[PDB]
């Protein structure tokens, strides 16, 4: 689960980490009024969307008149921002972060993730701030420094200094860097973060470390014990169908194609998509039924999948699960009738009563082919969109 920059910064504040003076405003009026609360211009106004690359899309500007803050807020509030990290549809700007201008002397990068290969939370620091960290990892690997949090001891100050000295920091900046590391590592552990990215972590002309930006990722699996983060969820930043599917115990992820996929199992889901791909198809989505395929669940699945116009056929691949193949067929039938599915539906069924459920599908009359095996299923759904 992603947080907004303003939220990450509130959090940083809460942990004594340095971030610009700023306020998240929801109206042009609040935004222009925040200028004076901040002080002397110029001020930085930033759209608050979960995606990055807001800069290159004009959502971040340094203005020097209240009249400008206002114009900016007016231009963006309620509008959707499209960055290279959002789909073509962009993310809604409901807050404009208005902060004090910062005097950048140098730009560093400091971030952390759970490294699956070493099974540790790993902090990463680079003098290559302001740049996409992946790019720096690609090209100048020797400029990225890392430390692994020891699960037995918690973050240790020497790790912060290690990074500080490798960044060539010195003097008070080392102590300051260490503080930031210790607190970010503390936040990481205590809020069950999945990711922290400060890009850029800035050394100001006045010679102080400051978090110019902040990107926090929380572990969704830990939200049950993170009430604060739980409330910070901004649903508007994601395709609503995702949260929609989730209440229904479905995992939905919209894609580009026109062949809807409904499968039980994430692995089978991805694999199904790939097979539709292998057979010249174009998967419109990932939808993992995973929770018992009850009739209503399937109905929901269909509503969610078909809520996308590009969908010109739906492949249903169900291997096993809790419900028997005939009950699954009835639900597909019932969902296709009810939801008024106007598209061809190919179904692959494996398990008890696979054939009886196939028969039930064939005898429905509805445009639902019962495939005989997965390869077949694919070819048939692919074929079923040819022309459509």
């Amino acid at each position: 689960m992603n947080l907004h920059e303003y939220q990450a910064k509130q959090l940083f504040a809460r942990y004594g980490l340095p971030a610009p003076v700023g306020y998240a405003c929801t109206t042009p009026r609040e935004a222009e009024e925040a200028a004076s609360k901040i002080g002397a211009g110029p001020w930085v106004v930033k759209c608050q969307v979960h995606a990055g690359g807001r800069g290159k899309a004009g959502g971040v500007k340094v203005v020097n008149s209240k009249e400008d803050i206002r114009a900016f807020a007016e231009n963006w509030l309620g509008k959707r921002l499209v960055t290279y990290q959002t789909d073509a549809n962009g993310q809604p700007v409901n807050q404009i972060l208005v902060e004090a201008a910062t005097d950048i002397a140098k730009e560093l990068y400091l971030g952390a993730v759970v490294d699956r290969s070493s099974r540790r939370v790993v902090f990463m620091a680079s003098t290559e701030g302001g740049v996409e960290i992946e790019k720096v990892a690609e090209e100048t690997p020797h400029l990225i420094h890392k430390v692994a949090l020891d699960p037995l001891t918690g973050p240790m100050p020497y790790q912060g200094r290690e990074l500080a000295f490798k960044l060539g920091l010195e003097g008070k900046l080392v102590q300051q860097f260490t503080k930031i590391f210790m607190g970010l590592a503390t936040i990481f552990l205590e809020r069950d973060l999945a990711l922290i990215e400060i890009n850029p972590l800035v050394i100001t002309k006045q010679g102080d470390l400051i978090c110019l930006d902040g990107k926090l990722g929380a572990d969704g699996n830990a939200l049950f014990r993170q009430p604060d983060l739980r409330e910070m969820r901004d649903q508007s930043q994601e395709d609503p169908r995702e949260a929609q599917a989730a209440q229904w115990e479905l995992n939905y992820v919209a894609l580009d194609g026109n062949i809807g996929c409904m499968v039980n199992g994430a692995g089978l889901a991805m694999g199904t998509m790939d097979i539709v791909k292998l057979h010249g198809g174009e998967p419109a989505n990932f939808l993992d039924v995973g929770g018992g395929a009850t009739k209503e669940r399937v109905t929901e699945a269909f509503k969610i999948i078909l809520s996308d116009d590009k969908v010109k056929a739906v492949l249903v691949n169900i291997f096993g699960g809790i419900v028997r193949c005939d009950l699954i067929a009835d639900g597909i039938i019932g969902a296709v009738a009810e939801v008024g599915v106007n598209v061809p539906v190919v179904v692959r069924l494996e398990g008890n009563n696979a054939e009886l459920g196939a028969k039930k599908l064939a005898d429905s009359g509805l445009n639902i082919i019962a495939a005989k095996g997965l390869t077949d299923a694919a070819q048939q759904v692919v074929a079923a969109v040819e022309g459509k």
Partner: protein, 287 residues
């Protein structure tokens, strides 16, 4: 076969819960030597004709179970697994989905130091066809045989199971290591066990996007696996940085794409197959 056999004595944590009950009934019907269960608060009672204990330690003293299957909701798993480890259980199969990554991070460090083996979490379990069944997998599609299967996915494993039964190869043991980012056991751990297992003649390794377990497993296979390995990775068509269902199925930092894993496996000499439907065929080939 690896991990379990006709002699493995299993206890179930979360035994009196829905899934714990339902899946223990299945285990029992298959002949798994379920010998008991743990549900704090119901010690001293019986359920499915087995004794229910308040703690894993009481259950181990009582039954000598060396394996535990955990069906405890996510919020209490760390506690459960740690309790099992502490009670001497040598093998933990954790079915639970949703365990915080930071909890598994700690648990994994513990599992390794205590020398306890854990298959999961967010896994379907383990089954040595004809001998032992721990988990939620459907026992009727398996056939005692010679192919060992390891997978990060439950359903995809079934596809491979179906195929290997339909080619008459059968399965030695199936290990669903689960879809979480920090699993208790990984491909290399299980692969090594298949290599050392006389009954396993070929191996099916099923992966997906995210992490680098597959790439490391490839490197390991080239160097230490001699039996033939058929491999399949799901997620070729998966967007980057989006969780595809399983917590671990997510391409983070543009690293860990299906193609990379395929290629890394191909380079290590693994027989990869692009369509999961051809796992059986590919086995026939190197068999």
């Amino acid at each position: 076969s690896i991990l379990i056999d006709k002699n493995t004595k299993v206890i179930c944590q979360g035994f009196t819960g829905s899934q714990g009950t339902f899946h223990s009934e299945q285990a029992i019907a298959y002949g798994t030597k379920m010998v008991g269960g743990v549900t704090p608060g119901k010690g001293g009672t019986t359920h499915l004709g087995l004794p229910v204990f308040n703690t894993v330690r009481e259950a181990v003293a009582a039954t000598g179970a060396t394996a535990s299957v955990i069906y405890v909701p996510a919020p209490f798993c760390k506690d459960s697994i740690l309790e099992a480890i502490d009670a001497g259980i040598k093998l933990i199969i954790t079915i639970t989905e949703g365990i915080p990554t930071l909890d598994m991070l700690t648990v994994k460090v513990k599992l390794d130091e205590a020398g306890v083996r854990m298959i999961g979490p967010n896994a379907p379990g383990v089954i040595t066809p004809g001998e032992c069944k721990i988990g939620i997998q459907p026992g009727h599609i398996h056939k005692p045989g010679k192919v060992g299967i390891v997978s990060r996915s439950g359903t995809l494993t079934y596809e491979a199971v179906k195929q290997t039964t339909d080619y008459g190869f059968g399965q030695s043991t199936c290990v669903g290591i689960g879809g979480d980012p920090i699993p208790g056991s990984n491909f290399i751990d299980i692969l090594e066990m298949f290599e050392k297992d006389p009954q396993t003649e070929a191996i099916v390794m099923i992966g997906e996007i995210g992490g680098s377990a597959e790439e490391e497993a490839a490197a390991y296979i080239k160097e230490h696996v001699t039996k033939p390995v058929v491999g399949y990775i799901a997620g070729v068509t998966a967007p980057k940085g989006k969780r595809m269902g399983h917590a671990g199925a997510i391409i983070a930092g543009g690293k860990g794409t299906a193609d990379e894993k395929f290629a890394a496996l191909e380079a290590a000499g693994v027989k990869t197959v692009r369509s999961l439907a051809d796992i059986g065929e590919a086995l026939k080939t190197v068999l």
